[PDB]
């Protein structure tokens, strides 16, 4: 098909784009680029599945930037190969306003990116969440005799920055439990980021722990050159089936700069005009700025028609597939067109107030088995035990080696890269309903991966038991405290907090139909009653009325609860009362969805000229004033907790109905 | 000398003691506690040099439990070797109301828990900080010809739990790499460790991963009743002395229990009184609910003479060292008294409005080198970032293994680790102010870490900067938003926001004077004015007035910003005056602080009757209303941001002079 010199130019073709793009921005990271550039020539001209008129074709490889620094690699080679997603204008407005090639790749700009990176480490986790939704629906769908429906590989670029942080030990000590055989990870040995060399921080045998982790190690001494061997390197991945690989390629940051190449200063720095010139001179390369030869495209957008054949012999795979197995195709089809099925909202129980109270962390295990039947694509699991977490689909057992088509996952204690690989589970965009689950205040742990789900539109659900003091003993290091509001305060996150069953199961619609926004749901270890007028649709409106004493008649006091205290504020309306106060109970389920509806909506429920306001919560008191104002008041606790039985807690804490009716009383006076 | 027989009863003294609390409690832990009662056998009675009597001994051992849900185990521990922290009346209140025995171990509750643990993998990285305090010390005082001053080994036990959270691994690479010979980690390997989960979820090697680490490792094959081989590793991991030792101890969970030893029930749930029967049984156990044998005592009460001896012996140490080295005595003594030095807040400079403006990231570079030569103690580093970030001290090097005297950590890229880190060396208590850095983004790695600085009272001082969307073109992926928010909730963390020079000395006087609390300072890639007004002093007072139109006379409205948004709620109020108004331009550099002022000052900067309110600020508008109130306005930035040059991302997220001064018409009605 090709000569070796040909190779040569369509390589350095790759590095030039990158160079000249990140010149003309005055930002960026070329050094990556310029040493993985022979990666790039080989995984997509020669290795890789995929269509690029055609980004969300099912059964194309997946390929996933860690080192999300690198980005004008990546956008190097979609535009090479004739994404049109990256046309060379995209290319020369790198790291501009409204451009398609953002600074780190980012899934929700640019068609043909696969999740967003840039934070070390989580690119990895993220390919192995799509490793895992491959082996999972391969399992369930393939049958012996016939081609298979599901079959591709998920390839990862990542560098020392993601070696070192612990996502990556977490979600690779997984992967390698799991034995992803398909997934396959190119790292880029070249001693650097910021800080130097790697000498300085960064001495361990990292092919010795991965051994450890239960991968293959393939060692590529010359990843500047050797384009046979990380051909060989590739196909010897591929040979090996029951483990991920972690091919070892040793290159050099800035290969073809003669006065920069291996430097701190060519990984986030342009490499200028002067450098630019004796690199273009070093490399041999007479062509001009953006200026790719012709004989470069012909090869590269050779990937046009290959990725057309690819997916039109899968379309021919299907039809044989749907010929032998109607049902199964039929069932195939409707999960991975990402529609949500007719009616699976229908699947969730109804809750009166007779009915005796239960923990909203028993309601949630309620509605993970009433909807587990109905969506096909419910997966997930736990970083904890599911005794003390209660997150199981009964109708499935254990995601393990060899038996990949149960949908329950165990994630260990790796918070972190649970997030992340329910967010590449997401992302693989194949109808997976990813939820994980840990106690709320170790979302800690997990942050960035949180963010990560917001930011890129992936639907994850979190469901996060022991919300509060309420869980007691274990004490502060447990307790939550900030967590609402830290996320409250986090663009493009649902932050639920359900009072009874009905809000539980509301808060679980939200999260089912936002498949492209994450769903916090904070969930309590204690009992609660189900009060009366709490509903399903309430939650949707994020804040709702479920009291007042006179109706047609505008509150005196309104009186604001979430959770467990809900049940404060009627409880404290009761009194208020007596003494002939005309009181007003809101439920505040979810502050982002009340936010998101009409100004008459809210105004009706938060009346302007009605300043006498109490908030209840067993959460901090901050953010609270958005609906409380000035002259309102909170009923919480904003220190830390404290070690003791949970009602000891609640008293002393002072968050208790008789609170809640004397601060209603002070801002009667106000 | 002791008896196999007599060892043995030892062992079953810590076994039901812990046993028993938990049956008090109804809440807790006994299953590691059961399978590690020999270890903490030959740690207190033979390995660990400490003084019961005196928690805060200078030279003693370190001992951190990482598997902080065991909290039994040290409190027996603790108890049989005359810790006063921990009578018997205390035992019998583990996990109630104000007792010195919380369901986690807390060094701000009870004397001689050395840091806060039970997020997992917290007390492996809190031990590695204890580790590098203690080599830093070493190398920066003794002396070769006189009796060591500092000479201690730090003991860590951590489990299947800890050795799964990503932070233990980043610490356990850099110890490795610092070749931390005085660390020594005891793995309960008792698989059924739960979560996860025996054969599930954890198959990983993890003698081999440690190696790759750049450990030595150890195997104890039956961690139930061989004494010997514990105490022949313990003597073999001090013979390795240029490699951290990780002894893999093979236990089984709840050891002694005939029908819950080697369950997932017997990790979290007391025993209950019929397999607590039962234990006693099979242990040939007769003594009643914390009954503990007076011959038992007799050995573990021994601690109390040997402690004494042991701190005598060191206090010689330091008398003959003194008559040799009496200048480097003093400065001993002075660094580990934990007291600041006399007049060190003089070394911060003084700006000016003519001072030309530099970013704070730039300020706090100025500040880190100022204060370096005046506190012996500053000692800290960064995530991979001194280049963007500017905060190494240039009076000292590189710490590294063969320069541990040296001041500056690398932490590589290491963000969580490096928080946990940091609180060992705060926690060590020795006099040492640590300071680490990264991109604030990146604070959502190291949140638990940075959480737990505040619960543990630890003074650690987080440097964060590219603060804000004025990074520019790195895009939505790097540009804080929520950030400032989520730590203002945090309790007892600071989080300070200085504008300009002045306010970023401010900053840096309050975050070394607060020893007992973290400050998380937020920094600025892009340059900013030293405006008029702005004070070391008023970042002390939280929020301050740094404008009036007319001395005197009440504001029409109030215009309230931080950091690089203070200039926009100046300029704005200049163009507000031009029109005719009477305008306060208020500082909010730290909202904590605040709030511990008097009513009457807070009444002073915010009056009640001016409800005219905007505040600017590049980030969320979370928050705000506590001091915009429901009819004032934000000038922020609420979403995600973009990949853009900083002064296009102002300008297109309408953060800019004129929103200020359309809001602040808005907010006048």
Redesign the interface.
Known sequence: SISRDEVEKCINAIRFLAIDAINK?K??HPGMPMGCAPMGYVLWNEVMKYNPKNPDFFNRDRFVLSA?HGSMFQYSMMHLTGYDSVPLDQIKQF?????LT???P?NFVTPGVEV?????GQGICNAVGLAVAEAHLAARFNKPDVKPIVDHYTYCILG???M???????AC??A??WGLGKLIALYDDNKI???GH?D???????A??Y????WHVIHVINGNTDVDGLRAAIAQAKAVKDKPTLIKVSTLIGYGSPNKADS?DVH?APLGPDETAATRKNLNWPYGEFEVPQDVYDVFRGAIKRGAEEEANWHKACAEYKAKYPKEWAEFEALTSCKLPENWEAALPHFKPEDKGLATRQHSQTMINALAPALPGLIGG????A??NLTLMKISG?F?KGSYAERNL?????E??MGAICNGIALHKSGLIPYCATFY??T??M??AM?MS??SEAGVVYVMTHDSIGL???????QP??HL??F?????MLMIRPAGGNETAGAYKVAIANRKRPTTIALSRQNMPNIPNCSVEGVAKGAYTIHDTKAGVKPDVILMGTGSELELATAAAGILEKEGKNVRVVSFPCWELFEEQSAEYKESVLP?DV?ARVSVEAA?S??W??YI??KGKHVGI???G????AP?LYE?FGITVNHVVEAAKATLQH
Not at 95 to 99: E, G, H, K, P
Not at 164 to 170: A, D, L, V, W, Y
Request: aromatic content about 6%; hydrophobic content about 30%; some cysteine.
């Open positions: 921005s930002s960026g999300g790291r501009q306003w409204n451009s953002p600074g780190h980012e967003t990176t840039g934070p070390l020392d920055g993601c070192m942080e612990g996502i990556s030990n977490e000590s997984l390698g439990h980021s910021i800080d790697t300085i921080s960064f001495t361990e045998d990292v010795k722990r051994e450890a982790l239960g701190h986030g736990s970083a904890d035990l005794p003390s254990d393990q165990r994630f260990g204690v790796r972190h890269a205040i170790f800690d742990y942050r960035n963010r917001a930011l007691g003993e274990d004490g502060p290091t447990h405290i900030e509001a830290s409250r305060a986090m663009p493009d302007s300043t901090t901050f953010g004033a958005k104002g000035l904003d220190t830390f404290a070690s003791a039985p000891t002393k």
